[PDB]
Amino acid sequence: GKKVLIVYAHQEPKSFNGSLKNVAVDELSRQGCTVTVSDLYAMNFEPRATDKDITGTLSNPEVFNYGVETHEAYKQRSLASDITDEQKKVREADLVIFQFPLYWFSVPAILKGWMDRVLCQGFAFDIPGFYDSGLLQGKLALLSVTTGGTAEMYTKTGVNGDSRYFLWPLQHGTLHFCGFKVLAPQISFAPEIASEEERKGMVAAWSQRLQTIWKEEPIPCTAHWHFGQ
Amino acid sequence: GKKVLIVYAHQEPKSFNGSLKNVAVDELSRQGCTVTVSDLYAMNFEPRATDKDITGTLSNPEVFNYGVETHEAYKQRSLASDITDEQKKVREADLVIFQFPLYWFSVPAILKGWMDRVLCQGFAFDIPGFYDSGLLQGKLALLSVTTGGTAEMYTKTGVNGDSRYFLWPLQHGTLHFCGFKVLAPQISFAPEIASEEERKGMVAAWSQRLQTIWKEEPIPCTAHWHFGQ
Ligand SMILES: Cc1cc2nc3c(=O)[nH]c(=O)nc-3n(C[C@H](O)[C@H](O)[C@H](O)COP(=O)(O)O)c2cc1C
Ligand SMILES: Cc1cc2nc3c(=O)[nH]c(=O)nc-3n(C[C@H](O)[C@H](O)[C@H](O)COP(=O)(O)O)c2cc1C
Numbered sequence: 001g002k003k004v005l006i007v008y009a010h011q012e013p014k015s016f017n018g019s020l021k022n023v024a025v026d027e028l029s030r031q032g033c034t035v036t037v038s039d040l041y042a043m044n045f046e047p048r049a050t051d052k053d054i055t056g057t058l059s060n061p062e063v064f065n066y067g068v069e070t071h072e073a074y075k076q077r078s079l080a081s082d083i084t085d086e087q088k089k090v091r092e093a094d095l096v097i098f099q100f101p102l103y104w105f106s107v108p109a110i111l112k113g114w115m116d117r118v119l120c121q122g123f124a125f126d127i128p129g130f131y132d133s134g135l136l137q138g139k140l141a142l143l144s145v146t147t148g149g150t151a152e153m154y155t156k157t158g159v160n161g162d163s164r165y166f167l168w169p170l171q172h173g174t175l176h177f178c179g180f181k182v183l184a185p186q187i188s189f190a191p192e193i194a195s196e197e198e199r200k201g202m203v204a205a206w207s208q209r210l211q212t213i214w215k216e217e218p219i220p221c222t223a224h225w226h227f228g229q
Numbered sequence: 230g231k232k233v234l235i236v237y238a239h240q241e242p243k244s245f246n247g248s249l250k251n252v253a254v255d256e257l258s259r260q261g262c263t264v265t266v267s268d269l270y271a272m273n274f275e276p277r278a279t280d281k282d283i284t285g286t287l288s289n290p291e292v293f294n295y296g297v298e299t300h301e302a303y304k305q306r307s308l309a310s311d312i313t314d315e316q317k318k319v320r321e322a323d324l325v326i327f328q329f330p331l332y333w334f335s336v337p338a339i340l341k342g343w344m345d346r347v348l349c350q351g352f353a354f355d356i357p358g359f360y361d362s363g364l365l366q367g368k369l370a371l372l373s374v375t376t377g378g379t380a381e382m383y384t385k386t387g388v389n390g391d392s393r394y395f396l397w398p399l400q401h402g403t404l405h406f407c408g409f410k411v412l413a414p415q416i417s418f419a420p421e422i423a424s425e426e427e428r429k430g431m432v433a434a435w436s437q438r439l440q441t442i443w444k445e446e447p448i449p450c451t452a453h454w455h456f457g458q
């Protein structure tokens with residue numbers, strides 16, 4: 001059996017992102033997978049990395065260092081419960097799907113907040129214990145992104161550059177760093193201006209891909225894959 | 230005369246980021262510049278893009294579209310006051326400095342939230358004004374970043390890749406898109422493991438660069454600058 005966590009970042013359930021999340025739950029549940037959804041806006045998920053993320057005595061209350069304090073709080077079991085709840089969902093997952101609209105060539109801040117606060121030292125990685133030795137090794141991760149910009153816009157010679165260029169901080173700096181095996185991203189280009197038929201085709205392509213998701217190999221998460229260098 | 234806005238994202242005033250922000254205020258104020266600081270954690274700045282960003286009634290209450298609603302709210306002077314306050318600081322600025330520690334090869338979520346919510350359609354860009362024609366054309370922007378990783382790690386053959394690879398979503402996808410002239414980033418590598426003398430050298434390098442900031446030309450914000458090749 002497999003456990004899937006869907007980390008979802010969209011305000012509107014009737015949106016195209018909402019439809020992609022719903023077909024992921026539908027298809028994976030049909031396969032007999034165990035499915036969990038962290039609907040960040042519905043949870044009013046806290047995005048800010050603050051001293052409220054530590055419930056116990058701070059290691060150094062004179063000079064607050066978020067990384068040091070959260071690492072110590074993880075080992076002491078004194079992290080805020082909203083962080084621990086997400087870490088339990090991640091720890092048990094075989095696959096983590098991130099479903100979000102592209103905001104400024106990145107994740108919406110609420111999802112950036114989940115990354116910043118949930119993936120702390122001792123949990124996601126350690127020093128040493130990062131990249132191929134990351135603590136989330138063996139787990140799969142997949143970015144399912146929607147854009148405003150068209151596929152043509154997202155080309156080497158297009159105004160936005162190749163879509164792989166913006167994946168680097170998420171895929172390499174974050175997911176690879178934590179030891180995830182990164183599956184090929186699902187990019188659904190410009191659904192808002194696409195036709196009804198094209199929108200249906202994009203949802204069908206995602207549902208169809210999920211049917212064989214457990215057969216895929218991860219991408220080689222390198223500078224050459226992202227930039228051709 | 231010149232107006233400078235410093236958008237600052239660090240929880241601890243005694244930090245290295247705090248020292249960089251303080252020397253930027255000191256040097257620019259000494260030059261006779263008009264200086265404003267948006268200390269995001271001190272303001273408990275809201276990072277989430279929600280329907281609370283629009284005051285009064287929505288354009289379409291049946292299906293909530295953040296982009297459409299904020300664009301309409303901007304034209305109708307119906308945006309939340311925290312957004313409008315930031316837009317006034319940006320509108321008047323000749324230079325916007327972003328001072329932040331690197332979080333997951335990107336900005337901390339609180340600063341990602343400022344970008345998501347402040348830089349709305351009608352304000353920062355429109356059709357036709359984007360990239361070179363962006364509504365913030367003529368304004369300068371500068372990313373002053375601190376990292377955990379060393380300069381050696383941030384090379385093309387290093388574990389993290391070239392530091393220019395992670396700048397693409399911030400410099401091109403956000404700042405250039407809005408029409409800013411992007412000044413060369415200030416990257417201060419691994420201050421935490423640097424000696425007291427090295428930390429002083431990095432702060433002095435920033436203070437010295439600010440002395441001739443108004444003489445600089447912006448970078449050519451292209452795929453070739455970031456990835457070339
Ligand atoms: C704050 C904000 C920033 C955005 N930044 C980008 C961007 O960098 N690139 C892009 O192609 N679209 C961008 N968009 C457009 C969204 O990606 C697009 O509206 C969304 O993917 C459509 O999916 P949906 O219908 O489910 O909302 C942005 C939208 C918002 C609200
Ligand atoms: C949530 C989080 C994520 C981080 N991600 C990165 C990263 O992607 N790359 C990096 O080199 N350092 C990363 N760091 C380390 C910080 O960038 C580093 O501690 C900071 O720049 C030091 O500046 P300061 O002493 O003023 O805090 C991260 C730290 C935190 C808390």
Ligand SMILES: Oc1ccc(/C=C/c2cc(O)cc(O)c2)cc1
Nearest residue numbers: 067119120121173174177377378
């Ligand atoms: O609380 C924390 C959470 C995350 C981090 C991440 C650090 C990091 C450092 C690098 O050199 C490369 C990278 O890809 C990530 C540090 C503290």
Ligand SMILES: Oc1ccc(/C=C/c2cc(O)cc(O)c2)cc1
Nearest residue numbers: 148149296348349350402403406
């Ligand atoms: O409120 C907002 C609504 C829409 C957007 C879109 C941004 C965007 C940024 C890019 O670099 C390329 C692009 O094709 C689109 C930003 C803010």
Ligand SMILES: [Zn+2]
Nearest residue numbers: 172176221222
């Ligand atoms: Zn990688």
Ligand SMILES: [Zn+2]
Nearest residue numbers: 401405450451
């Ligand atoms: Zn550019």
